[PDB]
Amino acid sequence: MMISLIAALAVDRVIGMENAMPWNLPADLAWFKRNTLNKPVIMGRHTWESIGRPLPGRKNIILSSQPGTDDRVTWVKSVDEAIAACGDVPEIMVIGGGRVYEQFLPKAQKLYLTHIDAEVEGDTHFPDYEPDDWESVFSEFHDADAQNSHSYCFEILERR
Ligand SMILES: Nc1ccc(C(=O)N[C@@H](CCC(=O)O)C(=O)O)cc1
Ligand SMILES: Nc1ccnc(N)n1
């Protein structure tokens, strides 16, 4: 196997811009950690560079056409190699970015989405996912507050 995508989405499915997203959402990061801990995480090189260090308590797998540059994580050159590096686990987590999501979404059975009520002009988007193919099985809404800069709604969808 089961492959899942986990992503934080601004308005219009924006997930990235030139620099870090202009928001502060510790609740989202706690949700991300709770749902990825003890699972392998696959990420593209740009997402790796934006996180800046290995995610603890998870097998970190970086996709890049070029040789690796950090021995604390696993480096792979193809989608199939990334999957192979995960071994036989109950669930593989794909954590970004847009180019990686595009290639893994067809193979995915589960989406963990955080919908953030932030209007951000950004060049990178989460790929189209049709409701015909994806059934919402969990939803939890939260207002912005002293710790979280925008309102956010957690959602899990499973492939119909
Ligand atoms: N695109 C990002 C994804 C994850 C994180 C990150 O720092 N996550 C911590 C969570 C921080 C915490 O709640 O302690 C983790 O998963 O362990 C940062 C950027
Ligand atoms: N991939 C990511 C990064 C941050 N937050 C969530 N929910 N997903």
Side-chain angles (χ1 to χ4, degrees), residues 48 52-54 60 62 66-75:
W48 162 247
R53 94 282 185 188
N60 288 229
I62 321 310
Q66 289 290 98
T69 59
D70 193 316
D71 287 350
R72 301 171 293 168
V73 301
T74 299
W75 295 82

Side-chain angles (χ1 to χ4, degrees), residues 8 10 14-21 23 120 122-126:
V14 176
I15 58 165
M17 59 210 282
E18 199 181 348
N19 303 294
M21 294 288 284
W23 59 29
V120 177
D123 50 23
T124 309
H125 302 257
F126 197 78

